[PDB]
Amino acid sequence: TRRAEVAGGGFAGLTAAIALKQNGWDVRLHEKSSELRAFGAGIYLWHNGLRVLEGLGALDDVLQGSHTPPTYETWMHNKSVSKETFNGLPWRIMTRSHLHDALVNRARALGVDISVNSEAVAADPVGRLTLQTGEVLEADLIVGADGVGSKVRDSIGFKQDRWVSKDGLIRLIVPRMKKELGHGEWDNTIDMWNFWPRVQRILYSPCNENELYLGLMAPAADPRGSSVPIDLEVWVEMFPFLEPCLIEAAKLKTARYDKFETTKLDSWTRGKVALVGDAAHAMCPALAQGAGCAMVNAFSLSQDLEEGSSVEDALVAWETRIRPITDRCQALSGDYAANRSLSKGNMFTPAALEAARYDPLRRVYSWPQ
Amino acid sequence: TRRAEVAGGGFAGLTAAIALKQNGWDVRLHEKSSELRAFGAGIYLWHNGLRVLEGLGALDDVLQGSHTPPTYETWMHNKSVSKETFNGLPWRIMTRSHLHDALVNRARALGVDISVNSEAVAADPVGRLTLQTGEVLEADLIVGADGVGSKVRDSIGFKQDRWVSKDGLIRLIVPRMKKELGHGEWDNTIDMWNFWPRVQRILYSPCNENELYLGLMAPAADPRGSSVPIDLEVWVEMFPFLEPCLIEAAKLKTARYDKFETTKLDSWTRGKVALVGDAAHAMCPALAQGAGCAMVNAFSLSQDLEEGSSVEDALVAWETRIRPITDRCQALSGDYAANRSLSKGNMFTPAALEAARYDPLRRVYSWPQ
Amino acid sequence: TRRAEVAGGGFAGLTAAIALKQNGWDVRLHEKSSELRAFGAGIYLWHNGLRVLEGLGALDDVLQGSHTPPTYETWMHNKSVSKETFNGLPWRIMTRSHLHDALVNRARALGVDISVNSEAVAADPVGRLTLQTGEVLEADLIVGADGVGSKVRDSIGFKQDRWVSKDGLIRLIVPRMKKELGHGEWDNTIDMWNFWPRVQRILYSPCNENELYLGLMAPAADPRGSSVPIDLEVWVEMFPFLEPCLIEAAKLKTARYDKFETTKLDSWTRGKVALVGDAAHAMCPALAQGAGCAMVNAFSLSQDLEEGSSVEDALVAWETRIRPITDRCQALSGDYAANRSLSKGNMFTPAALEAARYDPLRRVYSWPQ
Amino acid sequence: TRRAEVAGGGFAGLTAAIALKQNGWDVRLHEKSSELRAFGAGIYLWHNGLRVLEGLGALDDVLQGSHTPPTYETWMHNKSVSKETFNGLPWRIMTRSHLHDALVNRARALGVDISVNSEAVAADPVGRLTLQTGEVLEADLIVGADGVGSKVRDSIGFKQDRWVSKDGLIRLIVPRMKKELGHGEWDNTIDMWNFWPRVQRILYSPCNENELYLGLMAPAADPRGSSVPIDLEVWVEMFPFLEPCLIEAAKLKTARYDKFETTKLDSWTRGKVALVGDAAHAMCPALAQGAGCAMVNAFSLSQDLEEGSSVEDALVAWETRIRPITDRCQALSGDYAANRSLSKGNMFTPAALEAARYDPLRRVYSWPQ
Ligand SMILES: Cc1cc2nc3c(=O)[nH]c(=O)nc-3n(C[C@H](O)[C@H](O)[C@H](O)COP(=O)(O)OP(=O)(O)OC[C@H]3O[C@@H](n4cnc5c(N)ncnc54)[C@H](O)[C@@H]3O)c2cc1C
Ligand SMILES: Cc1cc2nc3c(=O)[nH]c(=O)nc-3n(C[C@H](O)[C@H](O)[C@H](O)COP(=O)(O)OP(=O)(O)OC[C@H]3O[C@@H](n4cnc5c(N)ncnc54)[C@H](O)[C@@H]3O)c2cc1C
Ligand SMILES: Cc1cc2nc3c(=O)[nH]c(=O)nc-3n(C[C@H](O)[C@H](O)[C@H](O)COP(=O)(O)OP(=O)(O)OC[C@H]3O[C@@H](n4cnc5c(N)ncnc54)[C@H](O)[C@@H]3O)c2cc1C
Ligand SMILES: Cc1cc2nc3c(=O)[nH]c(=O)nc-3n(C[C@H](O)[C@H](O)[C@H](O)COP(=O)(O)OP(=O)(O)OC[C@H]3O[C@@H](n4cnc5c(N)ncnc54)[C@H](O)[C@@H]3O)c2cc1C
Ligand SMILES: O=C(O)c1cncc(O)c1
Ligand SMILES: O=C(O)c1cncc(O)c1
C-alpha cells in the first residue's frame, strides 16, 4: 500500500489527503497548529472548487448552510456600475470554518490520520519527511501543502518570486442584520468601492441567513481605515447604509489587518515531493480563485497518480497538465489587483473565469460565457 | 448482452437509449415520424435534468449556445411582483431543437440503432414489440417512450387518471429583437400575467442572443387568445412592450399549441415493459419539469437494470424508488395550473423545486433552499 | 353704498362675501347650520383658486400649513403609469377646515356680517330674500351660494340639466402614519386605480406632515365598497400598502360620502339674483375644480359689479364673460368620471387645465402647458 | 414730470426703467453696447423674480416658452443624492435672451427711451449724468445699473469689497437631444458633481422643448476642462450620458470661460443716485438669485419713490427696507460656493430660499417651507 505524508491542514492539504485516501493511499496529515482551524472569516468558491468538493464526497455538507447571491454587484461611490451572473456558472459564499469543517469531517470519515502540533521542517525528494520533533517519516509521496511560508518548499530550494502587497484588508463575520439594513438588495454580493473622499472599500458577502462576511479595505498608511478593532466612525461615514453591521464589527477583537503574499515557482515538484496551494502558487485575492486553484491542483494530483507510472513521473505529468490554468489565473488576478480593475465592474470576463470554468472531474471547460 | 427496444425518439426515449447503450445494452430506437425533430419551441431544464445530461455525456453540447437568465421574474399587470434565483440551483433555457440535436448526436456517436418511419403499435409484458407493419421484435426490455397517446401502454391496458385545464398555450420562437425592445431587463425570464381585462399571460424566455421563446397563454375557450396564427391585436393590446417580437410571431403560419393535460397511472411497469416520459406521467407545464422528470426517470431506469436482477424485478424496484418524486411534482404542478398560482410570484418554494434539486447521478438532493 | 345678501357660508359664499366687502359693499352672510364648518376632508386648489385667495387677502393663511406634493402620480394595478407636475403651474392640498378657517377669519377681519342658524328659502329677482322664518330681507344683490340643493334657485325656477355617475366616494382624514408606511414616495399625490378583481380606487393625498386625505372610490352599487364606516377588508385586500392608515380609517364612525353629480343651468342670473358654487354648476370631482370654479366665479362677480352698471346688466355681463370656462371644465370633468379616464394617467392635458391656468386677478391665462 | 436716467440695459436697468415708467416717470435708459443683448446663455428665476415680472406686466411673455423642471436634482458621482421641489415655490428656467427680449419689448411698449452706444462715465448726487460722448444730463433720479464695473458707482466713490473667484464655468445653449439622451429624467434640473477622477461638474438645465442650458464647471488650472471651445473628450469621459448634447456644445465658438465677480457696498445711495444689481451687490452664483435680487431691488426702488418724500429720503428708505434680504442671500451664496455646499444636495433650506420666498408686490414672505 502506497503511503502519503501531507504537510498542512488547510484546504490544499485536506483536499489532497481526502483525494488520495479515496484512491486507497494510506495517508497522514500534519498540521503544526495545536488544533485544526481555518482563518480569514469568509470565502468564495466557484464551479471548479465545487466540482472538487463533489469529487471529494463533501459537496452536500458545503451547500447546506451556504449561499449563492442572486447577483454579483459592483458599486463605485454608491452607484451600481455592474451586476453579473456569469451565465449560470455555479458559485458559493460560505464561512471559512464552514468549508473547513466539511473537509475535516470527510477526512476523518475516510480514516485520514491527523496529527496536530506536527510541523514539517524538511523534506527529501527520495520520500522523507522531517518533523520539528525530530521524527523522520518515509513515504512514497510527500505533499507540501504548508502555506506561503512552506518549509517543505524552502528545505529543498525552489527558484521563486515571493512578495507582499502594500495594502490589505480586515475580514470578519458579523450577523446579517437584514431587517436593520432596510430597503435594498441585501442578499447580493456587493463590491463597494470609493476613491473620494478617500480610498475605502467594502466587499459585502452574505454567507447564509445568519452570517455576513465583510472585507474592509483601506490603505496600510491610513491609520484609521486600517485599525483593528475597526475605527467605526470612518467606516460608518463612507458606508452609512451598513451601519447596523459595522456596529457589530466594531465589537470584534479577533479582527486583523492582513496583507497579501504571493509565490510563483519555476517548478512544483522534486522527485517524490509535490507542492500544492499557497506553498506553490499563492496569488492576489481579486478573482477569488486562491483556494479553488489549490483544491483543483490537489485533486488533480491524486488523478495523475492513478496512471500506473512512477510517483516521480506522475508528478511531472500532473504539473504539466494542470499548472497553466493557475498561472494565467494568478497573472490575471495580480494584474486586476494592482490596477484596481474590479472597481470598474464587468471584470469577470470569459478569460477571468477560465479557472472557474474548469471541471476537474471530467477535465474540461464547462459553463461557457 | 441484454437487448432493448425503445419506442419513440423524444427526450425520454433518447435519454433511455443512450443510458442503456452506455451500460452495454444493444438498443434500437423507433421513431414514428419521417425524421428526428422537436416542436420548434424553447424549454427550461434544471439541475436534475442537467445532471442527467452530464450522465449521458451530453451536457457540454447543451450548455454551449444556451442561456441562464440572470433572474426568473414574475409580473402581474405589468408590475414586478417577484425575482427568483433559487439559491444557486442550476437552470437553463434553450430551444428544443438544441437539446434534441445534442441527444441525437450523442445517441449516434455511441452507436444506438435509430429507425425512422417506424411506429410501435403494441407491446407484450413477455418482451415483444409490434410495429405498424405487424412485425414482432423480441428484446429483454421494452421502453414505452411514445408520448401522451402512447400505443405501447394502450396495447397493454394501464388504468389512467386524467385531468384537463381550462388553459392552453402557444409556444413559438422569434428573433430576440433586443434593440427594438428598448429599455429594460430583457435577458430575464419574465412571466407576464394578466387577469384584467381578460386572462392573458406571456412567458418571456430568452434562449440565446438570437432566439426568443414565447409562451402565449389564454383560456382555450377564447377564440382570439388561442388562435394560431396569432391574433396580433389581442396580444399587443395587453403586451405593448413586446410589440416588435409579436409582429414576427403573427408571421408564423404554423405554431405549436397544447391544452394543459395531466395523466397519472396505476403503475409504470408490466413484466418487461417500462413506460417513460409523457407516456407514463404527462403533467401540467407549471413547474417546467415534464422533460426533466422524463429524463430523470429514463436515466434512472438504466441504473436499476445494473444491480443484477431480472428485468421484471428491476423495473418494479425502479418505480418504487424514482416515482414519488415525479408524483409530488405532477400534483403540485397541476395544482398551480388550476389555481393559476404562478401569477402570485415567489412560487418556486422548496417543495416546488424538490424535483429540480434531485441529483440522479448520486441519488441525493442537492442545492438546498 | 350697495347692499348684498349672500346665502350659504361655503367657499363660494365666503369668497363672494369677502370680495364684495373689499369693494365697499355692505354684506350679510346667512349660514343654515348651527355653525361654520367644513366636511372634514381634504381639498386640491390650483393656480386659479390660489389667485382668488390672493385677491381676497387670504393666500398666506392657506399656504402656511398646506403642502404641494413633489409630483401628482397615477397608479394602475400598483404600477406607476404617470408622474405629472404641470409645467410649474401652482397647486396645493389642504384640509377643508384649513381653507375654511382662512376664509372665515378674513371675512371677519373685514367686518362681514355672519348670521348662523339662518336659512334662506326664497329669493326675488327684484331684490328680496326670504328666510325660513318668512322674514323678507331687501338688498341690491342676492347671492345664491347655498350648495347643490339650492333653495334660492329652486324658489325662482332654473332649468337644470342633471347627470349622475355609477361611482361615489368616501372622503376622510387620518394621521400621515409615515414611518409605518415604510419605503416609497409617500409625499406624492398617488391616484391608485384598480379594475381587477373589482373597481376600487384610492386617491392618496398628503395635506401636511400630520394629516392624510384619503378618497375611497367604489361603485355606489357596491355594498362593501361604499360602506361608511369603511369595510376594512375590501380596502386592505386591494391596497395592502396603505394598511396602517386604513386601520385608523375604519375607526371613523362618521365620514363624508358623495355620489358624483353634475348640474348645468340655462342661466346663472335672474334680475338681481346670482347663483354661485354648486348651486349653479356642481360638477364631477375628476379635475378637482369645483371649489376652484366656484371661487373664481364668486370673485369674478364682484369684479363686474365695479364697472358702473345696473346690478342686472352686470350679472348678465358676468355670466357672459366667466361661464364658458366653467362649462368646458364641467364637461371634461364629467367625461373623465364616466369613462374613468384618470386611471390612464397623464390626463391633465392643456385642455384639462384650462380652468387652473386662468388668472382671475388679471383675467388672462397663465402657466402655459 | 419727474425725469430718470438709468445707466445699463441689463435686467436691473430694464426693470428699474419699466417700473418707473409705469409710475409716470419720464425715463431714458443708456446702454453702452451698440445693441441691446443679454449674455450667459441661461438663467433661473424664482417666485421673487417672477413676481417682479408680474408687477412689470412682463410675466406672460416669460412663462410662454420657458420651463419648470419637475424637480431640482443633485448628483454626486452619478448617484442621485437629492430631489427638491421647494414645497411648491414657483421657479423657472429660460434663456437669457428670452428673459431679455420680454423686458425690452415691455420697455419699448411703455415708451422708455433707449439710447444704445451710450455709456455713463460719471454721476453727480445732485442729479447729473455724464456720458462718454461728453453730454451731461440733468435728472431727478439717477440709477446706476451698469454691472460689476459700475462707472456710476466708481465716479462717486463707494467703500466696497470687490473680488474675483478662482474658478468659473462655460455656459452655453445646445439643442435638447431628448430622444438621443434615451432613458432617464431629462426634464429635470440636474446638478452633476464629481471630485474623482477629477473636479468636473455640469449643471443641466432644460429651458424649453428645444433648448438646453449647460454650465460646464472645471478649475481654471485645468487646461482641458477650462478650454473653449470645449475639449469634448474630457467632458464625454465624465458625462458619457450627455454625449449627444456635448457634441453640439463642442461646435460652438462663442463659448467662454467666465469667472465670478462680487461686490459688497456699505451704501447703495448718494443723494439722487441709486445703485441696483451687480453695480451694488454682485454675488456668487450658487443660489441663482443674482438677477432676482437685482429685479426685486430695482422694482422696490420705484415703490419707495411713490411715497411723496424727497428722492433722497426715499432712496435711504429703499435701501433700509430691502437690502438685508440681498445681504443674507449674497453671504449664504458666497458661503455655499466657496464650500461647494451644493454638492451635498438638499441645500435649498428655508434660509437659502429666503430671497426666493420674498414677494415684492405685497412685501411679504410667501411659500413657506
Ligand atoms: C484576503 C484574501 C481573500 C481571499 N479570498 C479567497 C476566496 O474568496 N476564494 C478562494 O478560493 N481563495 C481566496 N483567498 C486565497 C485562499 O485563502 C488561499 O489560496 C488558501 O487559503 C490557500 O490554502 P492552502 O491550504 O494552500 O494554505 P493555508 O490555508 O495557508 O494552509 C496551510 C495550513 O498550513 C498549516 N501549516 C503551515 N505550516 C506548516 C508546516 N510547516 N507543517 C505542517 N503544517 C503547516 C497552516 O498552519 C494551516 O493549518 C483569499 C486570500 C486572501 C489573502
Ligand atoms: C406547453 C408545454 C410546455 C412545457 N415546458 C416544459 C419545460 O419548460 N421543461 C420541461 O422539462 N418540460 C416541459 N414540458 C413538458 C415536456 O415537453 C414533456 O414532458 C416532454 O416533451 C416529454 O417528452 P417524451 O419524449 O416523453 O414525449 P414526446 O416529446 O411527445 O416524444 C415522443 C417522440 O415520440 C415519438 N413516437 C410517438 N409515438 C410513437 C409511436 N407510437 N411509435 C414510434 N414513435 C412514436 C414521437 O413522435 C416523438 O418522436 C412542457 C409541456 C408542455 C405541454
Ligand atoms: C367628492 C368630491 C371631491 C371634491 N374635490 C374637490 C377638490 O379637490 N377641489 C375643488 O376645488 N373642488 C372639489 N370638489 C367640489 C367642491 O367641494 C365643491 O364644488 C365646493 O365645495 C362647492 O362649494 P359651495 O360653497 O358652492 O357649496 P357647499 O360647500 O355645499 O356650501 C354651501 C354652504 O351652504 C350653506 N347653506 C346651504 N343651503 C343653505 C340655505 N338654504 N340657507 C342658508 N345656508 C345654506 C351650506 O350649509 C354650507 O354652509 C369636490 C366635490 C366632491 C363631491
Ligand atoms: C455664472 C453665473 C450664473 C448665474 N446664474 C444666475 C441665475 O441662474 N439666476 C439669477 O437670477 N442670477 C444669476 N446670475 C447672476 C446674474 O447674471 C446677475 O446678477 C445679473 O446679470 C445682474 O444684472 P445687472 O443688470 O445688474 O448687470 P449686467 O447684466 O452686468 O448689466 C448691465 C448692462 O450694463 C451695460 N453697461 C455696462 N456699463 C455701462 C455703462 N458704463 N454705461 C451704460 N451701460 C453700461 C452692460 O453692458 C449691460 O448691457 C449668474 C451669474 C453668473 C456669473
Ligand atoms: O480583496 C479582494 O479583492 C477580494 C476579491 N474577491 C473576493 C475576496 O474574498 C476578496
Ligand atoms: O455655478 C453655479 O453654482 C450655479 C448654480 N445655480 C444656478 C446657476 O445658473 C449656476
**Ligand 2 in contact with B153 (CB < 6 A)?**
no
Chains interfacing with B (3 or more CB pairs < 8 Å): A, C, D
* Segment holding B93, helix H or strand E: strand B91-95
Q: Are D7 and D144 in contact (CB under 8 A)?
A: yes
What angle do helix axes A96-109 and A47-56 make, rounded to 10 degrees? 30
- State how far the Cα of A73 lies from the Cα of A95, in Å rounded to an integer: 20
Q: Strand locations in A219-293, DSSP E?
A: 257-265, 269-270, 273-275
- Which residues line ligand 6 at a C-beta cut-off of 6 Å? D 44, 169, 203, 215, 285-286, 288
Instruction: Evaluate the CA torsion angle C358, C361, C363, C364 in order and state its sign.
Output: negative
Q: Which of A96, A112, A90, A68 is nearest to A11 (CA)?
A: A96
Question: How many CA atoms within 13 Å lie on the side-chain side of C137?
Answer: 25
Chain A: closest CA distance from residue D77 (Å): 7
Chain C: closest CA distance from residue D59 (Å): 9
> What would you measure as the largest C-alpha separation in chain C, in angstroms?
62
* Segment holding A63, helix H or strand E: helix A59-63
φ and ψ of D132, to 5 deg: -65, -25
Q: Are C329 and C354 in contact (CB under 8 A)?
A: yes
Nearest to D88 among C64, C92, C364 (CB): C92
Chain centroid, CA A235 distance in Å: 26
- State how far the Cα of D144 lies from the Cα of A304, in Å rounded to an integer: 95
Q: Are strands D189-194 and D72-76 parallel, antiparallel or unpaired?
A: parallel
Specify the amino acid at residue A107: A
Nearest to A79 among D78, D195, D197 (CB): D78
Specify the amino acid at residue D300: S
Q: For residue D307, give the DSSP letter.
A: S
Q: Which residues of A touch B356 (CB under 8 A)?
A: none
For ligand 6, mutation pick of D43, D44, D207, D260 (most atoms within 8 Å of CB): D44
Cell of D331: 453671504
Experimental method of this PDB entry: X-ray
Q: For residue B87, give the DSSP letter.
A: G
Q: Are B88 and B96 in contact (CB under 8 A)?
A: no
In ligand 3, which atom is closest to the CA atom of C44? Answer: 8
Question: Which residues, listed in sequence order, are joined to residue A6 by a DSSP beta bridge?
Answer: A29, A143
CA dihedral in degrees (C110, C115, C121, C124; nearest 10)? -40
Nearest to D79 among A78, A195, A197 (CB): A78
Q: Are A30 and A131 in contact (CB under 8 A)?
A: yes
Chain centroid, CA C263 distance in Å: 14
Q: Which of A284, A302, A263 is nearest to A13 (CA)?
A: A302
Q: For residue B67, give the DSSP letter.
A: B
Sequence-separated (6 or more) residues with CB below 8 Å from residue B353: B46, B86, B89, B369
Q: Which residue is it, cell 442527467?
A: B52
Query: B interface mutation test: which of C77, C192, C194, C201 has the most B CBs within 10 A?
Result: C77
Q: What CATH number does domain A1-38+96-165+261-369 carry, 3.40.50.1220, 3.40.190.10, 3.50.50.60, 2.60.120.10?
A: 3.50.50.60
| Distance set, CA A94 to CA A168, A254, A258, C369 (Å) | 21, 19, 19, 57
Q: Which residues of D touch B182 (CB under 8 A)?
A: 183
Q: Which of C141, C95, C120 is nearest to C2 (CA)?
A: C141
b/e burial code for range D318-357 (CB count within 10 A of at least 16 → b) = bbeebbebbeebbebbbebbeeeebbebebbeeebbbbbb
For ligand 5, mutation pick of A203, A207, A217 (most atoms within 8 Å of CB): A203
The residue of chain B nearest to residue C75, with distances taken between CA atoms, is: B79
Question: Which residues, listed in sequence order, are joined to residue B191 by a DSSP beta bridge?
Answer: B74, B203
What spacing in Å lies between the alpha carbon of C9 and ligand 3's midpoint?
Answer: 9
Q: Are C285 and C260 in contact (CB under 8 A)?
A: yes
Burial of C266 (0-12, 13-18, 19+ CB in 10 A): exposed
- State how far the Cα of C103 lies from the Cα of C108, in Å rounded to an integer: 9
Q: Which residues of B touch D182 (CB under 8 A)?
A: 183
- Is B368 within 8 Å of A63 when comparing Cβ atoms? yes
- State how far the Cα of C225 lies from the Cα of C130, in Å rounded to an integer: 41
Question: Which residues, listed in sequence order, are joined to residue C258 by a DSSP beta bridge?
Answer: C169
Cα angle: A295, vertex A298, A299; to 5 degrees:
80
What spacing in Å lies between the alpha carbon of A192 and ligand 3's midpoint?
Answer: 57
Q: Which residues of C touch D368 (CB under 8 A)?
A: 63-64
Chain centroid, CA A45 distance in Å: 8
Q: Are C11 and C99 in contact (CB under 8 A)?
A: yes
What spacing in Å lies between the alpha carbon of C343 and ligand 4's midpoint?
Answer: 47
- State how far the Cα of B294 lies from the Cα of B360, in Å rounded to an integer: 12
Sequence-separated (6 or more) residues with CB below 8 Å from residue D41: D95, D96, D171, D172, D173, D213, D214, D215
Q: Which residues of C touch B74 (CB under 8 A)?
A: none
Domain locations in chain C? 1-38+96-165+261-369, 39-95+166-260
**Ligand 1 in contact with A43 (CB < 6 A)?**
yes
**Do the domains C39-95+166-260 and C1-38+96-165+261-369 match in fold?**
no
Size of interface B-D (CB pairs under 8 A): 3
Cis peptide before A197 (omega within 30 of 0): yes
Chain B: closest CA distance from residue D180 (Å): 13
Query: D interface mutation test: which of A79, A82, A194, A201 has the most D CBs within 10 A?
Result: A79
φ and ψ of D335, to 5 deg: -55, -50
Q: Which residues of D touch B185 (CB under 8 A)?
A: none
- State how far the Cα of D30 lies from the Cα of C260, in Å rounded to an integer: 61
Cell of B180: 427594438
3-state secondary structure (DSSP) of residue C302:
helix
Q: Are B31 and B118 in contact (CB under 8 A)?
A: yes
Nearest to C88 among D60, D92, D367 (CB): D92
Chain B: closest CA distance from residue D184 (Å): 10
Sequence-separated (6 or more) residues with CB below 8 Å from residue B179: none
- Is B77 within 8 Å of C196 when comparing Cβ atoms? yes
Chain A: closest CA distance from residue B46 (Å): 11
Specify the amino acid at residue C159: K
Q: Strand locations in chain A, DSSP E?
A: 3-7, 26-30, 42-46, 72-76, 79-84, 91-95, 113-115, 120-124, 128-131, 136-138, 141-144, 160-175, 189-194, 200-206, 211-218, 257-265, 269-270, 273-275, 358-359, 364-365
- State how far the Cα of B203 lies from the Cα of B323, in Å rounded to an integer: 29
Q: What CATH number does domain D39-95+166-260 carry, 3.30.420.40, 3.30.70.270, 3.30.9.10, 3.40.50.2300?
A: 3.30.9.10
3-state secondary structure (DSSP) of residue A270:
strand
